[PDB]
Write a structure and sequence with these properties.
This protein is of the alpha/beta class. It has four helices and seven strands. The protein binds 1-(5-methoxy-1H-indol-3-yl)-N,N-dimethyl-methanamine. 1-(5-methoxy-1H-indol-3-yl)-N,N-dimethyl-methanamine binds next to β1 and β4. It is classed as oncoprotein.
Length: 168
């Protein structure tokens, strides 16, 4: 069995744990908890292929800068989930992108753009502009609300598809 190695990163006020737990045990928590290092490993079926995903939830606080630059070339995919309600996290993505490219040492890298809190009428991040920004890198942008769970399953399939395309 192929063990997929990926991590979940994001800014403050995104609610990353809402999306992870939703797929892990189908549960949604409204409470906010700054998960520093929480393991979310589960058997996932991708295209009829049951595999083990080493999913880890990591917080992106400035308190851990050196620790965050310690190692990065040990992950296949970096789940960068932002919130459509947080315009800061949307613009911050550029910084994260630059960081990834710097360490990856390669431009050929499969990535996707998923946004959380799409169930909020308080939209700050425009989908049109997001599409343009995503198309600049060649990555797809999908709105994935954890509360109602809209297009989250399908989004995960596409995320892994690009990784498989990179494999072969
Ligand atoms: C770079 O740190 C990473 C990246 C991806 C990973 N997949 C699995 C692991 C290890 N696991 C114990 C979290 C991991 C670490």
């Amino acid at each position: 069995m192929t063990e997929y190695k990926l991590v979940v990163v994001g800014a403050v006020g995104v609610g990353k744990s809402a999306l992870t737990i939703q797929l892990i045990q189908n549960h949604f928590v409204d409470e906010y908890d700054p998960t520093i290092e929480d393991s979310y490993r589960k058997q996932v079926v991708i295209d009829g292929e049951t595999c083990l995903l080493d999913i880890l939830d990591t917080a992106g606080q400035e308190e851990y800068s050196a620790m965050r630059d310690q190692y990065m070339r040990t992950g296949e995919g970096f789940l960068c989930v932002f919130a459509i309600n947080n315009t800061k996290s949307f613009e911050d993505i550029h910084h994260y992108r630059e960081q990834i490219k710097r360490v990856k040492d390669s431009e050929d890298v499969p990535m996707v753009l998923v946004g959380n809190k799409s169930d909020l009428p308080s939209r700050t991040v425009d989908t049109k502009q997001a599409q343009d920004l995503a198309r600049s890198y060649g990555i797809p942008f999908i709105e994935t609300s954890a509360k109602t769970r809209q297009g989250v399953d399908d989004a995960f399939y596409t995320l892994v598809r690009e990784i498989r395309k990179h494999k072969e």
